[PDB]
Design a binder for this molecule. Structure first.
Ligand code: HEM
Ligand code: CAM
Ligand code: FES
Lengths: 404, 106
C-alpha cells in the first residue's frame, strides 16, 4: 500500500487491486463489481499499485472520458511508471491533435479492412472449428481464442506467424505483467521488432497494414517513422490481446448455459444482438486518465497529476445503467456499455472485433451446437488493463456435431 | 421509412430505415459511401457529415452543443444544412428525407 496522500480523505479509501482483485475466484467481472456494492462510494482511492482514484459507476466513467480537458490520456495505464512510458498514437494524445491519427488507423483496422478480410476471417473460423469437431474436446484459449484473431491480424499486418509467441508475450506484459518485464521494457522490445520492418516498407511500400501506416498521411502531411512506430505498436496489442480474451469469456458462458446455446441455434439472426449483450456482461478493459489540474468531481477534490482508473467494464455492469446486470439477456431492450471505450478514443477496431465474435458464435454453434466445461475443471480468470481466462477446457460428443 | 443518400459522384441509394435508427447506423450498416461513423454516434467526431436536403431541415430537431462543436471541424465544406447524421434519429415524419454525403470525412 502506498502512503495515503494528504488531499485524499480517509473515508474514500478502498484498497482494490486491478491486477489481482480479492474476489477473482468468483469471476473477474464479479471481482471488479464489489466496487459497486451498497457500502462503496461512487469515487474511491486505492493505495494499491502506487495509489489512484477509481470511478465505480457508469455516470462518472462516461463523464470523465467526455471531458478530456480535465482527464488527459497522456498517462492512461496504472503503475504511475507504465502510464508515463505509454505513447501509442490515437490514445496517448488529447483531441485537437489526436483526431488526425484516427483516420490513418481506420484505413488498416476499420470497416474497409474488415471487407478486405471477410473471406479469410470466415474460412479460418470454419477450418479451425472443423479440425477440432471430431476430437470431442479442446483447450479453447490455445486452440481457437488465440490463433483465430491473431493469425488474421498477422495476415493483415504482413507478419510471419512464427513471430506470434514472441509478440504475444510482449503484449501480455503490457496488460497482465507477470513481473519479468516493466511496461517500458516490453514497449521498447515491441518497437525494436517494428523499427526495421517500417523502414523496409517505407522503401518498398506494399499492401499490409504496416506499409499503409508507415507511408500514410495525417491531415495532408506524411507521417514520421516515429509516429508510424507508435501507431503500429498499438495495433499489435489490440490485435493480439483484446478479442483473444473476450472469445474465452463468451464461450465459457455458453458452455455453462445450454438455454442460451439453444436460443442462438434456434434463431441465428439474434447472434449480433447476443454479441452486444455478451460485450456488456463480459466487458474486460480498464485503463484511465490523469488530472490536468486540481478539480472537484462529484464532491471529491482531485489534485493535478492524480491518476484515475475509469474502468470501461464497470459502466455496463452498473445496476443504475442496466437492471439485473449480472444476468445475460439476449433480448435486453437497452444494452448500455462502454466496453469499446467512450468519448473521442472510441475503439477503431470494434467492427473487426464484432465480426470475429459473430463469425465465431455462428460457425461454432453450426458445427458444435452442444458443449460443456470439462468435468471437474474450475475456470480461473486473470485481471489487468485487459482481463482474460487462463484456460478453458471444453468437451462434447462428436456424435452430436455436423460437418458443413 | 425511406431515406436517400446521394454520394459525391452523384450516385443515389434508397433505404427503408425503422424508427429509432440514426442515419449514420443505416448508412454504415448498408455499406453506404464515405460515411465512417468512427466515434460510434456520440457526437465526438465529424466523419458522419451530410447535407440534409433543404426541404427536411425544419423537420429535424436542431444540433445540440456537442454537434455544433464537431461541425466546426468537418473536412468538407460547411453548409447551413450540414449535420452529423448520427444525431438524426429516423421517424415516419422524416419519410423520404434526402441527404448528400461529402466524399471527405477524416
Ligand atoms: C473485444 C475487443 C476490443 C475491446 C473491448 C477494445 C476496447 C478498446 C477501448 C476500451 C479503447 C479506448 C481506450 C482509451 O480510451 O484509453 C480502445 C481503443 C482502441 N482500440 Fe480497441 N478494443 C477491442 C479490439 C480492438 C482491435 C481488434 C483493435 C485492432 C488493432 C483495436 C484497436 C484500437 C485502437 C487503435 C484504439 C485507439 C483509439 C484512439 O485512441 O483514438 N481494438 N479499444
Ligand atoms: C486499453 C486498450 C484495450 C486500447 C487498445 C489496446 C489497449 C491495451 C491500449 O493500449 C488501448
Ligand atoms: S459518428 Fe461520430 S459524430 Fe457522428
Amino acid at each position: 500500500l502506498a502512503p495515503l496522500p494528504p488531499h485524499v480523505p480517509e473515508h474514500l479509501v478502498f484498497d482494490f487491486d486491478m491486477y489481482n482483485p480479492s474476489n477473482l475466484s468468483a469471476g473477474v467481472q464479479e471481482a471488479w463489481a464489489v466496487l459497486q456494492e451498497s457500502n462503496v462510494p461512487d469515487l474511491v482511492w486505492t493505495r494499491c499499485n502506487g495509489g489512484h482514484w477509481i470511478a465505480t459507476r457508469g455516470q462518472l466513467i462516461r463523464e470523465a472520458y467526455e471531458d478530456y480537458r480535465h482527464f488527459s490520456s497522456e498517462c492512461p495505464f496504472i503503475p504511475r511508471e507504465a502510464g508515463e512510458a505509454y505513447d501509442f498514437i490515437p490514445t496517448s494524445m488529447d483531441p485537437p491533435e489526436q483526431r488526425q491519427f484516427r483516420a490513418l488507423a481506420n484505413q488498416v483496422v476499420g470497416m474497409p479492412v474488415v471487407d478486405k478480410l471477410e473471406n479469410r476471417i470466415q474460412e479460418l473460423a470454419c477450418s479451425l472449428i472443423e479440425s477440432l469437431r471430431p476430437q470431442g474436446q479442446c483447450n479453447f484459449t490455445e486452440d481457437y481464442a488465440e490463433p483465430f484473431p491473431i493469425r488474421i491480424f498477422m495476415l493483415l499486418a504482413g507478419l510471419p506467424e512464427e513471430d506470434i509467441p514472441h509478440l504475444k508475450y510482449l503484449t501480455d506484459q503490457m496488460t497482465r505483467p507477470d513481473g519479468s518485464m516493466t511496461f517500458a521494457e516490453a514497449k521498447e522490445a515491441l518497437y525494436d521488432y517494428l523499427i526495421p520492418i517500417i523502414e523496409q516498407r517505407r522503401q518498398k511500400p506494399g499492401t499490409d497494414a504496416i506499409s499503409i501506416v508507415a507511408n500514410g498521411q495525417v491531415n495532408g502531411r506524411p507521417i514520421t517513422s516515429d509516429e508510424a512506430k507508435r501507431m503500429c505498436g498499438l495495433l499489435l496489442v489490440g490485435g493480439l490481446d483484446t478479442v483473444v480474451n473476450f472469445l474465452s469469456f463468451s464461450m465459457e458462458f455458453l458452455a455453462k448455459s445450454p438455454e442460451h446455446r439453444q436460443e442462438l441455434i434456434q434463431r441465428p439472426e439474434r447472434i449480433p444482438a447476443a454479441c452486444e449483450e455478451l460485450l456488456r456482461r463480459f466487458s474486460l478493459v480498464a485503463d484511465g486518465r490523469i488530472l490536468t489540474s486540481d478539480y472537484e468531481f462529484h464532491g471529491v477534490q482531485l489534485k493535478k497529476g492524480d491518476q484515475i482508473l475509469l474502468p470501461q467494464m464497470l459502466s455496463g455492469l452498473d445496476e443504475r445503467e442496466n437492471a439485473c446486470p449480472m444476468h445475460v439477456d439476449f433480448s435486453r431492450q437497452k444494452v448500455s456499455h462502454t466496453t469499446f471505450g467512450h468519448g473521442s478514443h472510441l475503439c477503431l477496431g470494434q467492427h473487426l472485433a464484432r465480426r470475429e465474435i459473430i463469425v465465431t458464435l455462428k460457425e461454432w454453434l453450426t458445427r458444435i451446437p452442444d458443449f460443456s466445461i470439462a468435468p471437474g475443471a474450475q475456470i480461473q480468470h486473470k485481471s489487468g488493463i485487459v482481463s482474460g481466462v487462463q484456460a478453458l477446457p471444453l468437451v462434447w460428443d462428436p456424435a452430436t456435431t455436423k460437418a458443413v | 421509412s425511406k431515406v436517400v443518400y446521394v454520394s459525391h459522384d452523384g450516385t443515389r441509394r434508397e433505404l427503408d430505415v425503422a424508427d429509432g435508427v440514426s442515419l449514420m447506423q443505416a448508412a454504415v450498416s448498408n455499406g453506404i459511401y464515405d460515411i465512417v461513423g468512427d466515434c460510434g454516434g456520440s457526437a465526438s467526431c465529424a466523419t458522419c457529415h451530410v447535407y440534409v436536403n433543404e426541404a427536411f431541415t425544419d423537420k429535424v430537431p436542431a444540433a445540440n452543443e456537442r454537434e455544433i462543436g464537431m461541425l466546426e471541424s468537418v473536412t468538407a465544406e460547411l453548409k447551413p444544412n450540414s449535420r452529423l447524421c448520427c444525431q438524426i434519429i429516423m421517424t415516419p415524419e422524416l419519410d423520404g428525407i434526402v441527404v448528400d454525403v461529402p466524399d471527405r470525412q477524416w
